[PDB]
Scaffold this active site. Structure first.
Site, PDB file in Angstrom:
ATOM      1  N   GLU A  35       0.815  -1.209   0.000  1.00 40.79           N
ATOM      2  CA  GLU A  35       0.000   0.000   0.000  1.00 40.79           C
ATOM      3  C   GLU A  35       0.855   1.269   0.000  1.00 40.79           C
ATOM      4  O   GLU A  35       0.614   2.188  -0.787  1.00 40.79           O
ATOM      5  CB  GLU A  35      -0.969   0.022   1.194  1.00 40.79           C
ATOM      6  CG  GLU A  35      -2.122  -0.989   1.137  1.00 40.79           C
ATOM      7  CD  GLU A  35      -3.110  -0.757  -0.012  1.00 40.79           C
ATOM      8  OE1 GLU A  35      -3.035   0.289  -0.697  1.00 40.79           O
ATOM      9  OE2 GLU A  35      -3.969  -1.641  -0.224  1.00 40.79           O
ATOM     10  N   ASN A  46      -7.416   8.786  -6.246  1.00 35.78           N
ATOM     11  CA  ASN A  46      -8.187   7.838  -7.041  1.00 35.78           C
ATOM     12  C   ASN A  46      -8.910   8.552  -8.181  1.00 35.78           C
ATOM     13  O   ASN A  46      -9.152   9.757  -8.103  1.00 35.78           O
ATOM     14  CB  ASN A  46      -9.178   7.095  -6.144  1.00 35.78           C
ATOM     15  CG  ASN A  46      -8.487   6.366  -5.003  1.00 35.78           C
ATOM     16  OD1 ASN A  46      -7.466   5.707  -5.207  1.00 35.78           O
ATOM     17  ND2 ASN A  46      -9.032   6.488  -3.799  1.00 35.78           N
ATOM     18  N   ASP A  48     -11.923   8.548  -9.088  1.00 35.47           N
ATOM     19  CA  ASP A  48     -13.233   9.069  -8.692  1.00 35.47           C
ATOM     20  C   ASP A  48     -13.163  10.361  -7.865  1.00 35.47           C
ATOM     21  O   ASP A  48     -14.196  10.917  -7.493  1.00 35.47           O
ATOM     22  CB  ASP A  48     -14.078   7.988  -7.985  1.00 35.47           C
ATOM     23  CG  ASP A  48     -13.602   7.680  -6.564  1.00 35.47           C
ATOM     24  OD1 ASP A  48     -12.509   8.127  -6.165  1.00 35.47           O
ATOM     25  OD2 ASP A  48     -14.339   6.985  -5.838  1.00 35.47           O
ATOM     26  N   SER A  50     -11.610  10.652  -4.866  1.00 35.43           N
ATOM     27  CA  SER A  50     -11.222  10.331  -3.496  1.00 35.43           C
ATOM     28  C   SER A  50      -9.695  10.222  -3.406  1.00 35.43           C
ATOM     29  O   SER A  50      -9.005  10.232  -4.425  1.00 35.43           O
ATOM     30  CB  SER A  50     -11.894   9.037  -3.026  1.00 35.43           C
ATOM     31  OG  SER A  50     -11.428   7.922  -3.766  1.00 35.43           O
ATOM     32  N   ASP A  52      -6.437   8.144  -1.020  1.00 34.62           N
ATOM     33  CA  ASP A  52      -6.033   7.142  -0.035  1.00 34.62           C
ATOM     34  C   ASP A  52      -4.885   7.692   0.802  1.00 34.62           C
ATOM     35  O   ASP A  52      -3.944   8.269   0.258  1.00 34.62           O
ATOM     36  CB  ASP A  52      -5.591   5.853  -0.740  1.00 34.62           C
ATOM     37  CG  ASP A  52      -6.745   5.098  -1.376  1.00 34.62           C
ATOM     38  OD1 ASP A  52      -7.913   5.522  -1.241  1.00 34.62           O
ATOM     39  OD2 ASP A  52      -6.480   4.055  -2.008  1.00 34.62           O
ATOM     40  N   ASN A  59      -9.180   5.082   2.440  1.00 37.28           N
ATOM     41  CA  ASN A  59      -9.874   5.848   1.404  1.00 37.28           C
ATOM     42  C   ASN A  59     -10.834   6.888   1.975  1.00 37.28           C
ATOM     43  O   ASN A  59     -11.682   6.568   2.812  1.00 37.28           O
ATOM     44  CB  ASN A  59     -10.625   4.880   0.477  1.00 37.28           C
ATOM     45  CG  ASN A  59     -11.063   5.523  -0.833  1.00 37.28           C
ATOM     46  OD1 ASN A  59     -11.145   6.744  -0.948  1.00 37.28           O
ATOM     47  ND2 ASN A  59     -11.345   4.690  -1.833  1.00 37.28           N
ATOM     48  N   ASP A 101     -15.756  -4.604   8.468  1.00 38.79           N
ATOM     49  CA  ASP A 101     -16.876  -4.110   7.659  1.00 38.79           C
ATOM     50  C   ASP A 101     -17.635  -5.185   6.871  1.00 38.79           C
ATOM     51  O   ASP A 101     -18.725  -4.916   6.353  1.00 38.79           O
ATOM     52  CB  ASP A 101     -16.395  -3.005   6.714  1.00 38.79           C
ATOM     53  CG  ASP A 101     -17.533  -2.233   6.095  1.00 38.79           C
ATOM     54  OD1 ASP A 101     -18.330  -1.640   6.852  1.00 38.79           O
ATOM     55  OD2 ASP A 101     -17.629  -2.226   4.851  1.00 38.79           O
TER      56      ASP A 101
HETATM   57  N1  LIG Z   1      -7.462  -0.547  -2.877  1.00 43.05           N
HETATM   58  C1  LIG Z   1      -6.198  -0.862  -3.121  1.00 43.05           C
HETATM   59  N2  LIG Z   1      -5.475  -1.433  -2.169  1.00 43.05           N
HETATM   60  N3  LIG Z   1      -5.656  -0.597  -4.308  1.00 43.05           N
HETATM   61  C2  LIG Z   1      -4.273  -0.909  -4.676  1.00 43.05           C
HETATM   62  C3  LIG Z   1      -3.783  -0.093  -5.861  1.00 43.05           C
HETATM   63  C4  LIG Z   1      -3.381   1.310  -5.429  1.00 43.05           C
HETATM   64  C5  LIG Z   1      -3.046   2.263  -6.580  1.00 43.05           C
HETATM   65  N4  LIG Z   1      -2.122   3.336  -6.111  1.00 43.05           N
HETATM   66  C6  LIG Z   1      -4.314   2.870  -7.186  1.00 43.05           C
HETATM   67  O1  LIG Z   1      -4.250   3.894  -7.866  1.00 43.05           O
HETATM   68  O2  LIG Z   1      -5.429   2.371  -7.027  1.00 43.05           O
HETATM   69  N1  LIG Z   2     -13.986   2.268  -2.096  1.00 45.47           N
HETATM   70  C1  LIG Z   2     -15.065   2.354  -2.858  1.00 45.47           C
HETATM   71  N2  LIG Z   2     -16.125   1.614  -2.579  1.00 45.47           N
HETATM   72  N3  LIG Z   2     -15.090   3.181  -3.896  1.00 45.47           N
HETATM   73  C2  LIG Z   2     -16.234   3.332  -4.789  1.00 45.47           C
HETATM   74  C3  LIG Z   2     -16.207   4.616  -5.554  1.00 45.47           C
HETATM   75  C4  LIG Z   2     -17.111   5.633  -4.908  1.00 45.47           C
HETATM   76  C5  LIG Z   2     -18.310   6.003  -5.763  1.00 45.47           C
HETATM   77  N4  LIG Z   2     -19.119   4.795  -6.083  1.00 45.47           N
HETATM   78  C6  LIG Z   2     -17.846   6.632  -7.065  1.00 45.47           C
HETATM   79  O1  LIG Z   2     -18.196   6.097  -8.109  1.00 45.47           O
HETATM   80  O2  LIG Z   2     -17.163   7.665  -7.121  1.00 45.47           O
HETATM   81  N1  LIG Z   3     -22.809   3.442   6.041  1.00 44.56           N
HETATM   82  C1  LIG Z   3     -21.934   2.761   5.318  1.00 44.56           C
HETATM   83  N2  LIG Z   3     -21.821   3.011   4.024  1.00 44.56           N
HETATM   84  N3  LIG Z   3     -21.172   1.834   5.895  1.00 44.56           N
HETATM   85  C2  LIG Z   3     -20.170   1.032   5.197  1.00 44.56           C
HETATM   86  C3  LIG Z   3     -19.849   1.608   3.847  1.00 44.56           C
HETATM   87  C4  LIG Z   3     -18.420   1.322   3.476  1.00 44.56           C
HETATM   88  C5  LIG Z   3     -18.231   0.134   2.545  1.00 44.56           C
HETATM   89  N4  LIG Z   3     -16.842   0.116   2.018  1.00 44.56           N
HETATM   90  C6  LIG Z   3     -19.219   0.211   1.391  1.00 44.56           C
HETATM   91  O1  LIG Z   3     -18.819   0.205   0.229  1.00 44.56           O
HETATM   92  O2  LIG Z   3     -20.435   0.286   1.591  1.00 44.56           O
END
Ligand SMILES: NC(=[NH2+])NCCC[C@H](N)C(=O)O
Ligand SMILES: NC(=[NH2+])NCCC[C@H](N)C(=O)O
Ligand SMILES: NC(=[NH2+])NCCC[C@H](N)C(=O)O
Ligand SMILES: NC(=[NH2+])NCCC[C@H](N)C(=O)O
Ligand SMILES: [Cl-]
Ligand code: NA
Length: 129
Positions: A35, A46, A48, A50, A52, A59, A101
């Site tokens: 990581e 990222n 989108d 976001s 990390d 994230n 989670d």
């Molecule tokens: N969720 C993860 N652990 N992703 C690993 C790949 C990280 C990479 N730096 C990216 O742009 O996504």
């Molecule tokens: N770690 C995650 N679940 N990332 C999902 C991306 C967040 C959102 N669904 C988007 O499209 O921008």
């Molecule tokens: N209230 C929540 N969304 N809780 C958990 C969400 C985070 C989880 N990674 C997802 O994609 O859903």
């Protein structure tokens, strides 16, 4: 801070990550290696919008607030900047929430792709723990 392999293993154990949610210390060290390369200050944007943060690349989409991820959550109730500290407490506490989670360590795609099913014990080999 850039941790050494065994140094990070010790810090993670101290903060109760070793065997947390059934994941041996080597899993956590392996995840951190791929990581962040053990660098607490690591940040990566990222596609989108976001970002990390930190040793375990937590994230902003779900887990921390950075003020620039529209529609996101802050489920660890922390500024994302807190995940960049030399002291790994915030990252460990948040990682405990993430791994609880539902999908275990699969939340870390790098863990799934690079650590899962491998000889993760190698990561703590020789460490005074
Ligand atoms: N969720 C993860 N652990 N992703 C690993 C790949 C990280 C990479 N730096 C990216 O742009 O996504
Ligand atoms: N770690 C995650 N679940 N990332 C999902 C991306 C967040 C959102 N669904 C988007 O499209 O921008
Ligand atoms: N209230 C929540 N969304 N809780 C958990 C969400 C985070 C989880 N990674 C997802 O994609 O859903
Ligand atoms: N297949 C690997 N690269 N495993 C990690 C090795 C870590 C370290 N050099 C050790 O053996 O203690
Ligand atoms: Cl699990
Ligand atoms: Na957020």
């Amino acid at each position: 801070k850039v941790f050494g392999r065994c140094e990070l293993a010790a810090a993670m154990k101290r903060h109760g990550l070793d065997n947390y949610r059934g994941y041996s210390l080597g899993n956590w060290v392996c995840a951190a290696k791929f990581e962040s390369n053990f660098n607490t200050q690591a940040t990566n944007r990222n596609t989108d919008g976001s970002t990390d943060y930190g040793i375990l690349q937590i994230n902003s989409r779900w887990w921390c607030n950075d003020g620039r991820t529209p529609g996101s959550r802050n489920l660890c109730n922390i500024p994302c900047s807190a995940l960049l500290s030399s002291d790994i407490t915030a990252s460990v506490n948040c990682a405990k929430k993430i791994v609880s989670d539902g999908n275990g360590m699969n939340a870390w795609v790098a863990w799934r792709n690079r650590c899962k099913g491998t000889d993760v014990q190698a990561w703590i080999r020789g460490c005074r723990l």
